[PDB]
């Protein structure tokens, strides 16, 4: 049932597990994903970002998400909106019954960001949505890229009133997130940190693993990202164990989907149906999610609570 | 809103025009087709065949065109069953809310064809869900066993069956390769006129993709090997609408469209890995090679005629 980020991530934190959330964009990516979920009885959090929203004109992505819901009744199902700017977006989700929303702020200065913040906290908290927010700002170390700092952090929750931090410790969005793979410097150590003084659930952002099987299918047939690479995963299992309990991956589906796409291309040109194409792409998404749920911890899980209704929810804040 | 294919081919046929009955299977083919019928305020038929079913689980395809009937409230938009085999196909598709099938006994012998029918028609009528049924088999005239459409028969067909629209064999057939060249046109349009006077109904025409030059040059050009492909040339299309034929049937159109943009944007762009960035334009693609075919089908300016008839109100044709 449509779960808030709230209580699915309160589970995680509770048990050291970390929840995958997966940007979606069609009915062949969210697909992709329920296969894989339910699968492993896992939890999910199903993301769409405002440019998402816009591609699939706001309501052909609400009905796939309904079409999700109502096809698996089991699962706990978060849908979110990722990297909201403004509450104008915030609102816009809301509408289309998201039961949880990310404010990202992060770029104003403290005071700002915690204005911003509260603002969207106040209304959305109202619906019983929950509410992502993010202190730091995201991009390699190697500038102009502000890390978490962790007393900050402390006091930005206190301030805001968020069910979730979204923490900045080097990470970027992309398929390009280190020069080299030698010199991958993640700053993991204040995870833990930010975890014990602000109390809740962490989130991760740009998490893709560029994994080299997909990456150099794209480059074998076609495709041009040679010097791409990604977060290795067992970072993403040490910052489970020390907090973090939303892992956002986008990049790693977009490259599953064109590697199979670019491979039906290749080996057979004749052919024109989507079907033969998308179905595979379909496929290799799933494929590619499996080992990536498993590693972080939350396949068996689903059936663990009574998902809270937004109605409910509405509690929690009074 | 949700229109029978009663009322939006018992208005093509009255004043002279035919609606495309496009094929869906996901998000970025509703939406190609539906910007274009919205732009040219056009009336439209989404068909979905039991294997776009299957690609989709059913609720998925069922929840695109409810986005669909919901974003565009304007538009008359006809939910039809392609090429129900069993009757039992076409009460899972009335029951996701459909409001027209087509039951497809056209490889069964007459007596056989009209018995299957008149069942799925006994069941669907009475829900107010139209049916379409078919006298005759799709083929490529140039041995033969292709069973083209008897206008003698076609009179009976109706009369016996009672069916909504009668789909037509004059040649056509499925997919990308329906002429050996675009020298060799083989089509049997001039019983058209005759089928329908005798008939009385909207007619259908089934396998009628018609291969256009930039769709398949853009495919042809970026990759892809389809030297040969050929389809049913508009103006055939065009004279077969003016003598009664109300609903085209275009698929291979589309896939040719999404594939062609995507191939293009392999090439031009190798470094672009993001699904938007190929399929949305393969969206746009459907979308411009569908606005010079609706504009000829001639459905193009009338999604206003009419005040549509809702599935329920539809149970007092019949009874
Ligand atoms: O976590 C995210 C994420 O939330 C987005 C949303 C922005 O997408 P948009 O282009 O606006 O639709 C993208 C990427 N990543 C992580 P990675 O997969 O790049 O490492
Ligand atoms: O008339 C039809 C038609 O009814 C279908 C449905 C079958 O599709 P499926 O492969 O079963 O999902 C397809 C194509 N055409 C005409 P064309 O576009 O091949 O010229
Ligand atoms: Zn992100
Ligand atoms: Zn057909």
Redesign the interface.
Same mark, same amino acid.
């Given at each position: 049932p449509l779960c808030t980020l709230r209580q699915m991530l309160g589970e995680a934190r509770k048990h050291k597990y970390g929840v995958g959330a997966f940007n979606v $964009? $069609?009915?062949?990516? @969210?697909?992709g994903i329920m296969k894989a979920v339910v699968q492993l009885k896992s939890p999910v959090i199903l993301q769409c970002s405002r #440019?998402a929203l816009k591609?699939? &004109?706001m @309501?052909?992505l609400?009905?796939?998400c309904?079409?999700a819901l109502?096809?698996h009744p089991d699962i706990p199902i978060c849908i979110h909106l990722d990297h909201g700017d403004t509450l104008e977006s915030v609102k816009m989700a809301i509408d289309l019954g998201f039961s949880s929303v990310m404010i990202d702020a992060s770029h104003h200065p403290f005071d700002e960001n915690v204005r911003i913040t509260k603002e969207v906290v106040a209304y959305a908290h109202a619906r019983s949505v929950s509410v992502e927010a993010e202190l730091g700002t995201l991009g390699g170390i190697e500038n102009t890229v502000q890390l978490t700092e962790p007393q900050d952090a402390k006091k930005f929750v206190e301030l805001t009133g968020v069910d979730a931090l979204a923490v900045a410790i080097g990470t970027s969005h992309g398929?390009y997130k280190f020069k080299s793979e030698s010199d991958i410097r993640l700053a993991i150590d204040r995870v833990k940190t930010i975890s014990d003084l602000t109390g809740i659930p962490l989130v991760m952002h740009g998490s893709s693993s560029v994994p080299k099987d997909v990456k150099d299918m @794209?480059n074998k047939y #076609? #495709?041009?990202?040679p010097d791409a690479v990604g977060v290795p995963i067992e970072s993403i299992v040490h910052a489970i164990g020390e907090g973090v309990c939303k892992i956002n991956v986008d990049?790693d589906s +977009?490259?599953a989907?064109?590697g199979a796409? +670019?491979k039906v291309?290749?080996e057979h040109?004749?052919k024109? &149906?989507? +079907?033969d194409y998308? #179905?595979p792409?379909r496929d290799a998404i799933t494929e590619m999610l499996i080992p990536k749920i498993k590693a972080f911890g939350s396949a068996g899980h689903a059936g663990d609570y009574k998902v809270v209704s937004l109605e409910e929810a509405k509690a929690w804040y009074k």
């Open positions: $964009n $069609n009915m062949e990516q @969210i697909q #440019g591609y699939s &004109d @309501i052909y609400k009905k796939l309904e079409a109502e096809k398929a @794209i #076609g #495709g041009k990202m990049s +977009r490259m989907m064109t796409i +670019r291309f290749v040109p004749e024109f &149906d989507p +079907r998308l #179905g792409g």
